[PDB]
DNA sequence: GCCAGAAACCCTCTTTTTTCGAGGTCTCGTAACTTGCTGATTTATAAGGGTTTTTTAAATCGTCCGAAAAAAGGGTCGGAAGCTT
């Protein structure tokens, strides 16, 4: 597992998306993150993002 | 001859520094005021009832805006159905 995450969110949503992702990966751009992570970890990240999606 | 460093040249951004402009504000100079002379001619006016133009409100219309409602979409949970064992 070696992940790159990119965000295209808007307005209020992008504040939330930042709140989620920033806990799992260093921010390497205004809307991008990139780190290694375990497969189970990634699955949990996906679940958390889906839990509250505008 | 090789290698390194420093220096000269090119371009753009960032920040002060200077400059400029608008405009605001005050004060004094002065061309055109005001006050004073006469007498022939022109103009205004005391009241109030009937009569034109503009103001003013109301209504209407149109537009715009905002809010609410409805639609749309992202997703979760539980249940039922289908398939496989």
Give the nucleotide with minimal C1' distance to the Cα of A48. B75
Task: List the A11 CA – B55 C1' distance (angstroms).
Answer: 53
Is-contact A7 A14, C-beta < 8 A? yes
User: Is residue A11 left, alpha or beta, with left meaning phi > 0 and alpha meaning psi from -120 to 50?
Assistant: left
Q: Is the CB of A8 under 7 A from strand B?
A: no
Sign of the torsion formed by the C-alpha atoms of A39, A45, A48 and A54: negative
Neighbour-count burial for A2-36, b at 16+ CB within 10 Å, e otherwise: eeebebeeeeeeeeebbeebeebbeeeeeeebebe
Give the method of determination: cryo-EM
Q: What DSSP element (H or E) covers A2? A: strand A2-6
- Ramachandran assignment for A18, one of left (phi > 0), alpha (psi -120 to 50 degrees), beta (any other): alpha
Tell if A50 CB is < 7 Å from nucleic strand B: yes
Q: Which of A42, A25, A32 is nearest to A6 (CA)?
A: A32
């Amino acid at each position: 597992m070696n992940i790159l995450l990119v965000s295209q969110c808007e307005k209020r949503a992008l504040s939330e998306t930042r709140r989620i992702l920033d806990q799992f990966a260093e921010r390497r751009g205004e809307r991008t993150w990139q780190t290694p992570i375990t497969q189970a970890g990634l699955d949990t990240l996906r679940r958390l993002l889906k839990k509250s999606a505008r």
